[PDB]
Design a protein around this ligand. Structure first.
Ligand SMILES: Nc1cccc2c1CN([C@H]1CCC(=O)NC1=O)C2=O
Ligand SMILES: [Zn+2]
Lengths: 361, 1070
């Protein structure tokens, strides 16, 4: 095998970046005016990491000044745009060697917002912060006071009766309400997270806070720009986790987005080469961003040009352009090992914008 | 949209219960919390003394005595973190010594909930609200604002905490859990440093230990209750028992019996009451099983071995604990409607409410009617009674009851409480009697069909007789103290009463079904009822008319009577109608005013209860009054054919009631009240609906059986007359068929093993004349998180049997069902599905709608459908008849736990949502967006809404976890504006217990926002109780509405009173 922490540290971007201890948040429902960077297209998720490479003096100004000292710009989901996410710069290097100015930055998604107005070649967006909606348990409202003492349980051994036990003791006071234990169970952050864990385990810990967890798996899920806007629209951790379980059951195959009815890969094949997941965002040399998904097998693709390690997002591997056999539409890349001792000798990296999740039959 | 929320039944379930010396140092009090209410009793060998209402859910309530104080003070903490210290004052005030809001800006509320504790030396209140922190309020005389400070806790998951006794400083003892397990620790609170100090001792306790008990100051130390073990600690002494007798369940409440701490009471999760004993210094522990009580939430030992068992799941109790080995026995029961888990209304057209109340062994049906009750003292088996008269065998008080049957009369003598049938000399007993009673000149009178008999008193004899000149059959009679007016079919005669003689005076003729001559000594006025169908008035001696006409069935009863000092005439119809006209004492003209009471013909009698009221017999018996307007008021009895007043040496100011097979003698309640009938089921009722043609209710219910599979006790569902089947604890679901009159369990159907019954409905479908019970089920497996299969079962109850008329398998859970224009509308998982009912007698899917949300809630008006889920997402849908299809109209995703929804009207939706709130969504392109037009912090968890009528526009009732019943109704914008002013001005004037601002209380809470579009009728109605100068203070700047003007106290007094009349009145506490 190879070092799984390497892809998330974006080593292909260069040697070293000055780091900033990020602590600026805007309070809920507020109206903020934030810069929007040109030619950035992606739907960015809170906690997700975003690397960039800037060449236009336009861009290079926006950031140079951003560094002092908000460090945050706005990323938009394009339908143009109804919603988006604040991204805060946590690392930055400014190379002007050969007299050519490049700015490389690593930002992280922070807050979800609703677009009010969009003014202008740099954009500034009028933006209302959407609150992260945090709810107690379903039972904390109807819970008998006498049974409060039992709400903490002995912790789970590192085994399924424990969950039957958990369900029986935590949701006991359902009897006071008009629904069963097993219903309240389907809105229980702790349960849902566990059900999601097991699926994510087949791609082999992680956050314990439901908000974080729900945002971490949100960024892993290979879905399409129209479905990504949906979860982004979602304000609740619970509804995020739920909806996320839905996709993981309902979306087994992955097809060419362009010619639509053509299978590239399946759930079975998805694996986390990156520590972060089966999917992360990566910049190419011209500054374009790709959320690429690592799979073992991929069908109906043609390979053109020569395997190359040039600017490779996976140190140790060379990339070859892969495209849909039918439509010729560029679906992603095949990665091959350069050492005969490395595990995965090949894997496919598929760009998310090129795919369409399908529920077969 | 603008709504009025008012309570119709205050919360009945007990939150907490404390004793101590509060009223006086001498008194011993029991203090009982019922959510937002606080009842104060004095213990005796319980006298209610004072009840008050917080603007707050009572979450902590302790008694304590500060140094150099003469009686205990009371600490309350509300769920909104309103603290206060309260004092009783003798008419009676509860005063606020101290108060303040102990909330923190930061702070994750602890999983184990709020915990309030006061140390033994009354130095401080210790508050555990959040993980990591321990809040301390010093009890210094000069801390009126309850300002406080926090101490950091290394331990983040504390299960339970108490201060200990007998320490050289205030000391907390607590059980906490971390990665290595569960442990007890102690900390010393350094008063000077304001910080924790290394405690006296600490100790890995039982895995499931959860209850801390601080033992008083001989032994001191702490007791720890767990799942299998009870353990004692102090310094480094240590005692551990693990008796079998506590194996079976979980100890969840406790209380100290005596100061010594020798004995403790312990309450199971399942009804068991234990006694724990400390054996003596301290050498051992022993548990004893006292027996079964209501499932206890809280226990208090009072005195003379009497114990208060505060229940939430059932009725609360008083239990007497009585060699022969320890036992406990029930003394008293106190009504709990708590968990109102579902309800329905019978007689929407009286009007009674039926609930599914309680849980496990406490499960019951509650039947709730408003009305005047009757205490019965005696019953006599005599079939066929057709008249009742009180009478007086001797010149003081009645002692004779005369009853008539078809062509027969019988006389009953009364000696105290013993009734003996006798003969009255002078009274013929072979005819049916039309009137008899006491008359003028020391005499007695019997008016039969044949003749009219004047009888003397001392040696009783027939002194004078009167019969028709042609010896004909009398059709109707009427007589008062001194006059007689008898009708003979075609014409009628006027007669008088003088000593020894009754001689005629008038001999008229008619163009007659009832008469009256009640004087308002001699009445110069006469009431008549004639194919001419009119209530005619006639002059005495003269007979020469006023009149009125009624049109349409012949009138049965007529009466002239006086309410207040106004005069009326009453005429009751043979179809069940009642007409009430205004009268003219000297003139004779009549005016105005009608009401129906029940199709069986009505009979009217006078009685005194200082003034005069009228009893009306029919299918529904009714008392009438009054305040210069007249009032309907139902009597809590099944039909009574006849009544009369009875005042005896044995039955003073009492009543005699006769129906078809029984005569009853009873006293009659002065005020109305709520009459609750309880049908214990000994299992959890889950749904109810009312099938009128089968005259019975369907009730979904479940019971808990334990593995090899068998029940824990006899249940409704195991003790039905007939029963059918479909063929570690488990759940067994049934449909019960409960008879509507006798509340017998007529039938129990039992669903499939692991089949969960979720929804129920009674209805007609398509072109089928039958009414069906229709259950929605779901298949519940432990391995399977998401429901993947379920049934819709269509049952029919004919004869004594439940038949299965049809099934429909469905690829998921049937959460909800509503009958929808003769079709069946069912929500299955995340689909909403509409079914047609064919002639093949099968449910055949017409259409189907998938949503982003699991269709938990379904409600309909006309063609509109409201779809909702646990998470508070609502969808408005429209069935399109020409499309055979659904259409989403509006939608609103706004994430909060939601517990119940209802449609108010085409454009407005009511909902209950997290932290005991109510909200209202309004319909009015991108106007598929619903607007939030009303919020209100209710203070209850609503389970069920239903359209109803208790007796403002429309009416929605709600039932609640704490057992409170509420009412919601619409107000015009004009009234909302008026009442909003009023609330604010009433807020300036009314003293609130913990000095909590009404505004803060009603503010929508989770986030916090002000209340809106809701009027607290509970607050408005208190306007009536403030002083006359305060009433005028409040109405100083209010615009009333006619055609507007400065409102007066009297305009408001009558406005608020009309308002009190739309729900049941509250009972006085004392
Ligand atoms: N050279 C070139 C020119 C235009 C686009 C792109 C490239 C290389 N590249 C990707 C290829 C896969 C990788 O591992 N790193 C990259 O940077 C592109 O997306
Ligand atoms: Zn293609």
């Amino acid at each position: 095998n190879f070092d799984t922490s390497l892809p998330t540290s974006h080593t292909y971007l260069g040697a070293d970046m000055e780091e900033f201890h990020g602590r600026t948040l805007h309070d809920d429902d507020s109206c903020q005016v934030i810069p929007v960077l040109p030619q950035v297209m992606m739907i960015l998720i809170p906690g997700q990491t975003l690397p960039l490479q800037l060449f236009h003096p336009q861009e290079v100004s926006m950031v140079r000044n951003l560094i002092q000292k908000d460090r945050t710009f706005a990323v938009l989901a394009y339908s143009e745009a109804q919603f988006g996410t604040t991204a805060e710069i946590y690392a930055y290097r400014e190379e002007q060697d050969f007299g050519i100015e490049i700015v490389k930055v690593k930002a992280i998604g922070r807050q979800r917002f609703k677009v009010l107005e969009l003014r202008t070649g740099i954009q500034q967006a009028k933006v209302q912060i959407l609150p992260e909606c945090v709810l107690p348990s379903t039972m904390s409202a109807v819970q008998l006071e006498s049974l409060n003492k039992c709400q903490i349980f002995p912790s789970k051994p590192v085994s399924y009766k424990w969950w039957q036990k958990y369900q029986k003791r935590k949701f006991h006071c359902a009897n006071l309400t008009s629904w069963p234990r097993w219903l309240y169970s389907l809105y229980d952050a702790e349960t849902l997270m566990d059900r999601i864990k097991k699926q994510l385990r087949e791609w082999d810990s992680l956050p314990s806070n439901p908000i974080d967890f729900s945002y971490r798996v949100a960024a892993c899920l290979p879905i399409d720009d129209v479905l990504r806007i949906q979860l982004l629209k979602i304000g609740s951790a619970i509804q995020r986790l739920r909806c996320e379980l839905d996709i993981m059951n309902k979306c087994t195959s992955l097809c060419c987005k362009q010619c639509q009815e053509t299978e590239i890969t399946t759930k079975n094949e998805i694996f986390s080469l990156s520590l972060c997941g089966p999917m992360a965002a990566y910049v190419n040399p011209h500054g374009y961003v790709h959320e690429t998904l690592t799979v073992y097998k991929a069908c109906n693709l043609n390979l053109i040009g020569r395997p190359s390690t040039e600017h490779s997002w996976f140190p140790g591997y060379a990339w070859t352009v892969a495209q849909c056999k039918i439509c010729a539409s560029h679906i992603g890349w095949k990665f091959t090992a350069t050492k005969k001792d490395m595990s995965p000798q090949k894997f496919w990296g598929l760009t998310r914008s090129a795919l369409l999740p399908t529920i077969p039959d | 949209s603008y709504n009025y929320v008012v309570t119709a039944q205050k919360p009945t379930a007990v939150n907490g219960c404390v004793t101590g010396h509060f009223t006086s140092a001498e008194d011993l009090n029991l203090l009982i919390a019922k959510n937002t209410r606080l009842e104060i009793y004095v213990v005796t060998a319980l006298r209610p003394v004072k009840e008050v209402g917080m603007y707050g859910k009572i979450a902590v309530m302790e008694l304590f005595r500060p140094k150099g104080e003469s009686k205990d003070l009371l600490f309350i903490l509300t769920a909104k973190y309103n603290a206060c210290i309260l004092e009783y004052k003798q008419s009676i005030d509860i005063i606020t010594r101290a108060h303040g809001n102990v909330q923190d800006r930061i702070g994750r509320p602890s999983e184990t909930g709020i915990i309030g504790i006061i140390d033994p030396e009354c130095r401080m209140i210790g508050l555990r609200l959040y993980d990591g922190l321990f809040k301390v309020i010093p009890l210094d005389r000069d801390n009126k604002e309850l300002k406080a400070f926090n101490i950091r806790l290394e331990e983040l998951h504390v299960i339970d905490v108490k201060f200990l006794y007998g320490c050289q400083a205030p000391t907390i003892c607590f059980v906490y859990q971390d990665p290595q397990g569960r442990h007890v620790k102690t900390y010393e609170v350094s008063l000077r440093e304001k910080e924790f100090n290394k405690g006296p001792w600490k100790q890995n306790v039982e895995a499931e230990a959860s209850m801390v008990i601080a033992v008083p100051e001989p032994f001191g130390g702490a007791i720890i209750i767990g799942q299998e073990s009870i353990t004692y600690h102090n310094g480094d002494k240590y005692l551990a028992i693990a008796p079998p007798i506590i194996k079976q369940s979980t100890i969840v409440c406790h209380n100290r019996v005596d100061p010594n701490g020798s004995r403790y009471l312990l309450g199971d999760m399942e009804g068991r009451l234990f006694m724990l004993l400390l054996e003596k210094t301290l050498k051992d522990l022993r548990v004893e099983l006292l027996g079964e009580t209501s499932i206890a939430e809280c226990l208090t030992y009072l005195d003379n071995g009497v114990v208060f068992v505060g229940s939430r799941l059932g009725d609360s109790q008083l239990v007497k604990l009585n060699e022969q080995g320890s036992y406990v026995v029930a003394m008293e029961t106190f009504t709990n409607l708590g968990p109102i888990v579902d309800m329905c209304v019978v007689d929407l057209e009286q009007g009674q409410l039926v609930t599914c109340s309680g849980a496990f062994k406490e499960g019951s049906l509650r039947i709730i009617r408003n009305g005047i009750g009757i205490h019965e003292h005696a019953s006599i088996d005599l079939p066929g009674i057709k008249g009742l008269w009180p009478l007086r065998s001797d010149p003081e008080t009645d002692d004779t009851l005369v009853l008539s049957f078809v062509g027969q009369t019988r006389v009953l003598m009364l000696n105290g409480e013993e009734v003996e049938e006798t003969e009255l000399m002078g009274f013929v007993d072979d005819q049916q009697t039309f009137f008899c009673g006491n008359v003028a000149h020391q005499q007695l009178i019997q008016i039969t069909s044949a003749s009219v008999r004047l009888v003397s008193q001392e040696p009783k004899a027939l002194v004078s007789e009167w019969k028709e000149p042609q010896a004909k059959n009398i059709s109707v009679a009427s007589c008062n103290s001194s006059q007689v007016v008898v009708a003979v079919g075609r014409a009628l005669y006027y007669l008088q009463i003088h000593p020894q003689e009754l001689r005629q005076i008038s001999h008229t003729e008619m163009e007659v079904a009832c008469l009256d001559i009640t004087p308002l000594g001699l009445s110069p006025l006469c009431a008549i009822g004639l194919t001419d169908i009119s209530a005619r008035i006639l002059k005495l001696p003269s007979f020469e008319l006023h009149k009125e006409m009624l049109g349409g069935i012949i009138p049965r009863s007529i009466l002239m009577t006086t309410f207040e000092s106004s005069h009326y005439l009453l005429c009751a119809l043979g179809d069940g109608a009642l007409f009430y006209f205004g009268l003219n004492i000297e003139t004779g003209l009549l005016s105005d005013k009608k009401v129906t009471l029940g199709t069986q013909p009505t009979v009217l009698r006078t009685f005194r209860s200082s003034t005069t009221n009228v009893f009306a017999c029919s299918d529904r018996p009714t008392v009438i009054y009054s305040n210069h307007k007249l009032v309907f008021s139902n009597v809590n009895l099944k039909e009574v054919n006849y009544m009369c007043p009875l005042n005896s040496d044995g039955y003073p100011d009492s009543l005699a009631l006769a129906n078809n097979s029984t005569l009853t003698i009873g006293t009659i309640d002065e005020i109305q009240k709520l009459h609750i009938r309880t049908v214990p089921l000994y299992e959890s009722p889950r749904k109810i609906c009312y099938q009128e043609v089968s005259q019975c209710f369907g009730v979904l219910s479940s019971r808990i059986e334990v593995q090899d599979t068998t029940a824990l006790r006899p249940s409704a569902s195991t003790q039905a007359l007939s029963s059918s089947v479909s063929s570690e604890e488990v759940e067994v679901h049934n449909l019960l068929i409960i008879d509507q009159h006798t509340f017998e369990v007529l039938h129990a159907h039992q669903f499939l093993q692991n089949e969960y019954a979720l929804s129920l409905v009674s209805c007609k479908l398509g072109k089928d004349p039958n009414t069906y019970f229709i259950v929605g089920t779901a298949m519940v497996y432990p391995e399977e998180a998401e429901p993947k299969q379920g049934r819709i079962v269509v049952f029919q109850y004919s004869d004594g049997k439940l038949q299965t008329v049809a099934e429909k398998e469905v690829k998921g859970a049937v959460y909800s069902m509503v009958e929808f224009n003769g079709k069946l509308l069912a929500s299955i998982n995340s689909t909403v599905r509409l079914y047609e009912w064919t002639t093949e007698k099968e449910l055949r899917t017409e259409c189907n709608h998938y949503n982003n949300i699991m269709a938990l809630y379904l409600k309909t008006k006309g063609d509109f459908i409201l779809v909702g889920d646990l998470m508070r997402s609502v969808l408005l849908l429209a069935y399109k008849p020409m499309e055979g299809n659904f259409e989403e109209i509006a939608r609103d995703f706004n994430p909060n736990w939601m517990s119940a929804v209802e449609i108010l009207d085409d454009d407005n939706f009511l909902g209950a949502e997290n932290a005991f709130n109510l909200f209202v969504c309004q319909k009015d392109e991108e106007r598929q967006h619903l607007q939030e037009v009303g919020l209100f912090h209710l203070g209850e968890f609503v389970n069920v809404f239903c359209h109803g009528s208790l007796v403002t526009q429309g009416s929605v009732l709600f039932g609640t976890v704490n057992g409170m019943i509420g009412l919601v109704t619409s107000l015009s914008e004009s009234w909302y504006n008026l009442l909003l002013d009023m609330q604010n001005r009433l807020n300036k004037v009314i003293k609130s217990v913990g000095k909590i601002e009404h505004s803060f209380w009603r503010s929508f809470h989770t986030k916090t926002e002000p209340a809106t579009g809701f009027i607290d009728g509970d607050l408005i109605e208190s306007f009536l109780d403030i002083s006359r100068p305060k009433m005028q203070e409040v109405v100083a700047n209010l615009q009333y509405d006619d055609g507007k003007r400065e409102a007066t106290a009297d305009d408001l007094i009558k406005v608020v009173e009309e308002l009190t009349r739309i729900h049941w009145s509250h009972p006085q506490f004392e």
